[PDB]
Design a protein around this nucleic acid. Sequence first.
RNA 1: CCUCUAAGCACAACCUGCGGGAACCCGUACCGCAAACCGACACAGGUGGGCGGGUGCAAGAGCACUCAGGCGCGCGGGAGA
RNA 2: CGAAUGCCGGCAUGAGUAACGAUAAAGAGGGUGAGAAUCCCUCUCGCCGUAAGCCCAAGGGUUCCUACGCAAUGGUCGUCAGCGUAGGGUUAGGCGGGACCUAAGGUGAAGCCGAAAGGCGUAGCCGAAGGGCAGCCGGUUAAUAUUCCGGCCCUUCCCGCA
RNA 3: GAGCCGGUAGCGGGCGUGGAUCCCUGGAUGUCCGAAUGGGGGAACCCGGCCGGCGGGAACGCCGGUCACCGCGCUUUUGCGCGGGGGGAACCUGGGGAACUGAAACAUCUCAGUACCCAGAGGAGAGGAAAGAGAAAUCGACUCCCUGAGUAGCGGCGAGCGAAAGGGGACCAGCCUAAACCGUCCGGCUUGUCCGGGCGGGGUCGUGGGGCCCUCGGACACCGAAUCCCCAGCCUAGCCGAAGCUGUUGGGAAGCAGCGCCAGAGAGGGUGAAAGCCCCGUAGGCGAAAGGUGGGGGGAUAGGUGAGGGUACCCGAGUACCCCGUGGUUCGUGGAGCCAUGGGGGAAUCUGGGCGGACCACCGCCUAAGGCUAAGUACUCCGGGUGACCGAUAGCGCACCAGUACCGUGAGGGAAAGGUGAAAAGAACCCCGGGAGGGGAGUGAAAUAGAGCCUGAAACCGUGGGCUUACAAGCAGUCACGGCCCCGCAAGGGGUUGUGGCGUGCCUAUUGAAGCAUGAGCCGGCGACUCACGGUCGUGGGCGAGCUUAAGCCGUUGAGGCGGAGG
Lengths: 71, 100, 92
Amino acid sequence: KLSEVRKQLEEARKLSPVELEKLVREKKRELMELRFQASIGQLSQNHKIRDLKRQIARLLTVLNEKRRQNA
Amino acid sequence: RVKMHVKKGDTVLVASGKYKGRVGKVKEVLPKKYAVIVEGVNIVKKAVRVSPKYPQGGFIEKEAPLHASKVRPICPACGKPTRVRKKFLENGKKIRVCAK
Amino acid sequence: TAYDVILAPVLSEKAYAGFAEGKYTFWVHPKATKTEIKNAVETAFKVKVVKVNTLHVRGKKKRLGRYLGKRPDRKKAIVQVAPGQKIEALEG
RNA sequence: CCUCUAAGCACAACCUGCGGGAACCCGUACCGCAAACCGACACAGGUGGGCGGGUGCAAGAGCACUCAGGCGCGCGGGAGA
RNA sequence: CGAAUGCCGGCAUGAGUAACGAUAAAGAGGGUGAGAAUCCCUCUCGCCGUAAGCCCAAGGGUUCCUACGCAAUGGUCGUCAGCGUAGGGUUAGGCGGGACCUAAGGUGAAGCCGAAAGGCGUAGCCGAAGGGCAGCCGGUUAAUAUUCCGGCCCUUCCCGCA
RNA sequence: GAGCCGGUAGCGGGCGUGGAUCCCUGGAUGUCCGAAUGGGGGAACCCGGCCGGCGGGAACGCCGGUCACCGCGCUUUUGCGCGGGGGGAACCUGGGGAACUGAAACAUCUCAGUACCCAGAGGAGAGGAAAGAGAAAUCGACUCCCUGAGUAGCGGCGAGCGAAAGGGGACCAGCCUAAACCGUCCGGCUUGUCCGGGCGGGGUCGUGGGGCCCUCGGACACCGAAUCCCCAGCCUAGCCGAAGCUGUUGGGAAGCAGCGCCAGAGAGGGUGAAAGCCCCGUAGGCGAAAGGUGGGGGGAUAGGUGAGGGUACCCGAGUACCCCGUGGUUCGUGGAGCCAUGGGGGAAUCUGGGCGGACCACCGCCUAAGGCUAAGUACUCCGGGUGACCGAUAGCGCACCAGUACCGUGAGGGAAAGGUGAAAAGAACCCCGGGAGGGGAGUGAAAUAGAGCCUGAAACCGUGGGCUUACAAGCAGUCACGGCCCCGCAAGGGGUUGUGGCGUGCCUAUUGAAGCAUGAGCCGGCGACUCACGGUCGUGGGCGAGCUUAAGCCGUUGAGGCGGAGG
Ligand SMILES: [Mg+2]
Ligand SMILES: [Mg+2]
Ligand SMILES: [Mg+2]
Ligand SMILES: [Mg+2]
Ligand SMILES: [Mg+2]
Ligand SMILES: [Mg+2]
Ligand SMILES: [Mg+2]
Ligand SMILES: [Mg+2]
Ligand SMILES: [Mg+2]
Ligand SMILES: [Mg+2]
Ligand SMILES: [Mg+2]
Ligand SMILES: [Mg+2]
Ligand SMILES: [Mg+2]
Ligand SMILES: [Mg+2]
Ligand SMILES: [Mg+2]
Ligand SMILES: [Mg+2]
Ligand SMILES: [Mg+2]
Ligand SMILES: [Mg+2]
Ligand SMILES: [Mg+2]
Ligand SMILES: [Mg+2]
Ligand SMILES: [Mg+2]
Ligand SMILES: [Mg+2]
Ligand SMILES: [Mg+2]
Ligand SMILES: [Mg+2]
Ligand SMILES: [Mg+2]
Ligand SMILES: [Mg+2]
Ligand SMILES: [Mg+2]
Ligand SMILES: [Mg+2]
Ligand SMILES: [Mg+2]
Ligand SMILES: [Mg+2]
Ligand SMILES: [Mg+2]
Ligand SMILES: [Mg+2]
Ligand SMILES: [Mg+2]
Ligand SMILES: [Mg+2]
Ligand SMILES: [Mg+2]
Ligand SMILES: [Mg+2]
Ligand SMILES: [Mg+2]
Ligand SMILES: [Mg+2]
Ligand SMILES: [Mg+2]
Ligand SMILES: [Mg+2]
Ligand SMILES: [Mg+2]
Ligand SMILES: [Mg+2]
Ligand SMILES: [Mg+2]
Ligand SMILES: [Mg+2]
Ligand SMILES: [Mg+2]
Ligand SMILES: [Mg+2]
Ligand SMILES: [Mg+2]
Ligand SMILES: [Mg+2]
Ligand SMILES: [Mg+2]
Ligand SMILES: [Mg+2]
Ligand SMILES: [Mg+2]
Ligand SMILES: [Mg+2]
Ligand SMILES: [Mg+2]
Ligand SMILES: [Mg+2]
Ligand SMILES: [Mg+2]
Ligand SMILES: [Mg+2]
Ligand SMILES: [Mg+2]
Ligand SMILES: [Mg+2]
Ligand SMILES: [Mg+2]
Ligand SMILES: [Mg+2]
Ligand SMILES: [Mg+2]
Ligand SMILES: [Mg+2]
Ligand SMILES: [Mg+2]
Ligand SMILES: [Mg+2]
Ligand SMILES: [Mg+2]
Ligand SMILES: [Mg+2]
Ligand SMILES: [Mg+2]
Ligand SMILES: [Mg+2]
Ligand SMILES: [Mg+2]
Ligand SMILES: [Mg+2]
Ligand SMILES: [Mg+2]
Ligand SMILES: [Mg+2]
Ligand SMILES: [Mg+2]
Ligand SMILES: [Mg+2]
Ligand SMILES: [Mg+2]
Ligand SMILES: [Mg+2]
Ligand SMILES: [Mg+2]
Ligand SMILES: [Mg+2]
Ligand SMILES: [Mg+2]
Ligand SMILES: [Mg+2]
Ligand SMILES: [Mg+2]
Ligand SMILES: [Mg+2]
Ligand SMILES: [Mg+2]
Ligand SMILES: [Mg+2]
Ligand SMILES: [Mg+2]
Ligand SMILES: [Mg+2]
Ligand SMILES: [Mg+2]
Ligand SMILES: [Mg+2]
Ligand SMILES: [Mg+2]
Ligand SMILES: [Mg+2]
Ligand SMILES: [Mg+2]
Ligand SMILES: [Mg+2]
Ligand SMILES: [Mg+2]
Ligand SMILES: [Mg+2]
Ligand SMILES: [Mg+2]
Ligand SMILES: [Mg+2]
Ligand SMILES: [Mg+2]
Ligand SMILES: [Mg+2]
Ligand SMILES: [Mg+2]
Ligand SMILES: [Mg+2]
Ligand SMILES: [Mg+2]
Ligand SMILES: [Mg+2]
Ligand SMILES: [Mg+2]
Ligand SMILES: [Mg+2]
Ligand SMILES: [Mg+2]
Ligand SMILES: [Mg+2]
Ligand SMILES: [Mg+2]
Ligand SMILES: [Mg+2]
Ligand SMILES: [Mg+2]
Ligand SMILES: [Mg+2]
Ligand SMILES: [Mg+2]
Ligand SMILES: [Mg+2]
């Protein structure tokens, strides 16, 4: 995951506000999708959940830095 | 962090007690217990079966931990302590004589 | 944030009983509004919501050893969907 | 709530129809003259309001019996000083 | 340390003693169970019935329902429970509060006073079991119901049209 | 630099030498409450305005901005900027300010300007450059320590209270203004060449200083910050580190043995027991991209650099000063000065005015009514290092999930409770039982280390055995014989007690207690003549017409020296 993690910061850093907010919306739904399965059992690869929870944290963290001057 | 000691998943010599002499490998270092695994101090553990699953239970079982001190690393020679070399761009543990 | 309002389905004899009619019940944000929930449900499961009932669920007090505590308080929202409409995800 | 008029505004506005929409937050279990409330206790004490049937007795929420409901009181068995 | 009606703790004596909490009251046959006068059912019997019945407010805070249970808590017993573990359960435009009103009182623009802290105080504001305000009858759950469902009947907003 | 996903085991999933977890630094995110600040409110909950965005969205809802009050300054206002508000263990300053006590009663006095309440400040605070001290042809800010000194003095001269000077040390620092006088802007008005407000210049002193005149004037000539800048160093993670093998006893070596080795390291801790060389370390030596701190060292600034003679212009006002009421000081009405000041009266500008303990004259000392100022000093919530400090009734109330459980309406009170083993190897399975619990088996060196488990005393409750008791009567024992039982070959000894003799518990308090006077159910643990500074004897030493230092300084880091103020 470490590797596939050092990407976002880049593949996500170069997009802008309107590109992220929508990307994050997408992720947030996926997270719902998950926590929605466990409640019934299905999904069990926890690693997935926490893994997605932290992704959003990054997108937001990156979007927060962009909204401070730029253009 | 600081919690560090002398061995890692490599080959060591037991200087301990019941297995003084015995030699083994990857001790799956803890180090919350500051112990290692090796291939000795392996006791017989009773078993009912933590859940029918995998029914029957025997007495030959697993290998117990061993205080990290009871063991000594070895490479291209025998027992002996460990020193640390800079590798001109690194930090690798080398033995007084050999090298790892 | 629309997927932050609906935490999960409830799953229970009583809850399922609702499915016959457009009655799906969910565990939602303790602070969420009936109106907030209506929207959340509409965009999440693509449906037309026409009624929303909610009730608070106080956490059961529990004790593991001499250590006494409580479970987190919750909000339950049972959303009623427009005539003949099903929230696919909650069927099965 | 009805009414009066000031600023204003009278291509606003209010008022009556008729259509189409909108209508949030908290409480809601359970005990509640009590073993769940106040009295260290499953304490013969204390606890505000409403319903509280029938027959008889002069009357009544009194008294005796009983509807509906609820209970025989959370140690017993004997003995006949 | 032997003493301070010493201090903390432990264990004795009284003692198998007084007690087991209203004198409304019990009996039997089935059942369950390792075991129950004590749990379940049936049939008798007694008590309350301006109740010892039902409902609301306060206070209490899951004690509600259910499945496994019985070490302890139950003044005995326990298979039972207001007890242990776990899972369920409380659904509102119209019921009660809040997006209304003011009461004593409280707070407090102006303003007054006091070594400091702080004490007053007009307007205003807060303050309810008072004023205002549109839902009645049924049916459903193991557990909610003027809240869910059914029938019938209403209330405010917003927009359009006349 | 190899393991990680806290206390985490567990199902069930993942990440890491292409370098995670982890540690340090800086940022991001930071629901609600709380000074709490949009309004409200029963803290963590309700309800809004305005601007922008979500949804069919106008009703409804959510999201992001933003809206408290007060004080300064800009300035009418509209508004705008800075700030303020709370918290903080002690420490500090200021505003208020007890009593029990002591005086062997008690009121002045004491306790004490203490405890406490309030406001404020900060890493310190206060104080601070002489209107001083007080006798010295003297000293020269303030604070802090030692002496001075239990002195001088105060005191119902009772209890008791208690200075300063000087000397020896720590530390070091000195400045800015007000006003003469000159300029400027603004607003008054009588536009008066004046009134007063703000600016700027000028000016800061006591062998008096300054203003304004006139002489002298020859300074890229020296001073130089308490301000700013940059460095070193320091703080917030870390890193490198010498030297042992074998045998033997044993569950286990590190013990013991043989023969070695390192040492700028033989501090310490751990590893199955006791180890310089197995592990962590220790001596010695390295280390910061980032954030702090930082004249210690450099600089750069602001700021400061004169004599003569004239004038007599100015040197802080409801003040000085006097009286009345008080406080402060060693000073309690005293011969009562000095410093503050609530009241009344009320000046002068160095030909002035205060002080040297009433007052007066001499001789002197000093310049009030404006402000600022490092260091030396105080404290310890926090981090570290040490201990002739404690070791679970001790030590903090808490070694443990404690300011908790419980208590109280509330302020508030406030517990108990630590240890298996080297390693969970935590007892499969079988047998009795519903379970609990046991008996086997098995683990271990040990299971009477089997789990609230190291050791496990005493009181207390039992089972088995030995002696001995139902005609005896007692502070329960003791002396003497005797019987039975038990040891050893014996002499002798141990246990029990049948008769005989003799016998008034312990403590306390009292003239006097078995006392029918007090206290104690029994056992275990806690539980009371100390310490500091003075004094007086005595005593072991040193030196003795003398003895001895205190603070502090230099040294060490369990090393001591110096220091003559002073007694
Ligand atoms: Mg590196
Ligand atoms: Mg509701
Ligand atoms: Mg609302
Ligand atoms: Mg109900
Ligand atoms: Mg009653
Ligand atoms: Mg009643
Ligand atoms: Mg009872
Ligand atoms: Mg009662
Ligand atoms: Mg009554
Ligand atoms: Mg009648
Ligand atoms: Mg009658
Ligand atoms: Mg009946
Ligand atoms: Mg009872
Ligand atoms: Mg005692
Ligand atoms: Mg004694
Ligand atoms: Mg005692
Ligand atoms: Mg006791
Ligand atoms: Mg007894
Ligand atoms: Mg008896
Ligand atoms: Mg008796
Ligand atoms: Mg009797
Ligand atoms: Mg009896
Ligand atoms: Mg009874
Ligand atoms: Mg009875
Ligand atoms: Mg009767
Ligand atoms: Mg009757
Ligand atoms: Mg009656
Ligand atoms: Mg209630
Ligand atoms: Mg419970
Ligand atoms: Mg029940
Ligand atoms: Mg049952
Ligand atoms: Mg019982
Ligand atoms: Mg229960
Ligand atoms: Mg209101
Ligand atoms: Mg007031
Ligand atoms: Mg008022
Ligand atoms: Mg009002
Ligand atoms: Mg009301
Ligand atoms: Mg009403
Ligand atoms: Mg019910
Ligand atoms: Mg209906
Ligand atoms: Mg854990
Ligand atoms: Mg984990
Ligand atoms: Mg950080
Ligand atoms: Mg607020
Ligand atoms: Mg407020
Ligand atoms: Mg808007
Ligand atoms: Mg401040
Ligand atoms: Mg003070
Ligand atoms: Mg004071
Ligand atoms: Mg004070
Ligand atoms: Mg007194
Ligand atoms: Mg006295
Ligand atoms: Mg005094
Ligand atoms: Mg300092
Ligand atoms: Mg200072
Ligand atoms: Mg300092
Ligand atoms: Mg001066
Ligand atoms: Mg001096
Ligand atoms: Mg000037
Ligand atoms: Mg000047
Ligand atoms: Mg090293
Ligand atoms: Mg080493
Ligand atoms: Mg041994
Ligand atoms: Mg050896
Ligand atoms: Mg020896
Ligand atoms: Mg060692
Ligand atoms: Mg050692
Ligand atoms: Mg050796
Ligand atoms: Mg070092
Ligand atoms: Mg730096
Ligand atoms: Mg003059
Ligand atoms: Mg005085
Ligand atoms: Mg005086
Ligand atoms: Mg005066
Ligand atoms: Mg005066
Ligand atoms: Mg004077
Ligand atoms: Mg005078
Ligand atoms: Mg004088
Ligand atoms: Mg003088
Ligand atoms: Mg004199
Ligand atoms: Mg003088
Ligand atoms: Mg001055
Ligand atoms: Mg001055
Ligand atoms: Mg000052
Ligand atoms: Mg100062
Ligand atoms: Mg200190
Ligand atoms: Mg303790
Ligand atoms: Mg102990
Ligand atoms: Mg502590
Ligand atoms: Mg304690
Ligand atoms: Mg209470
Ligand atoms: Mg064995
Ligand atoms: Mg042991
Ligand atoms: Mg031990
Ligand atoms: Mg033991
Ligand atoms: Mg014993
Ligand atoms: Mg016996
Ligand atoms: Mg006889
Ligand atoms: Mg006899
Ligand atoms: Mg005798
Ligand atoms: Mg006496
Ligand atoms: Mg005597
Ligand atoms: Mg007696
Ligand atoms: Mg006695
Ligand atoms: Mg007496
Ligand atoms: Mg006594
Ligand atoms: Mg007694
Ligand atoms: Mg004792
Ligand atoms: Mg004792
Ligand atoms: Mg002495
Ligand atoms: Mg002496």
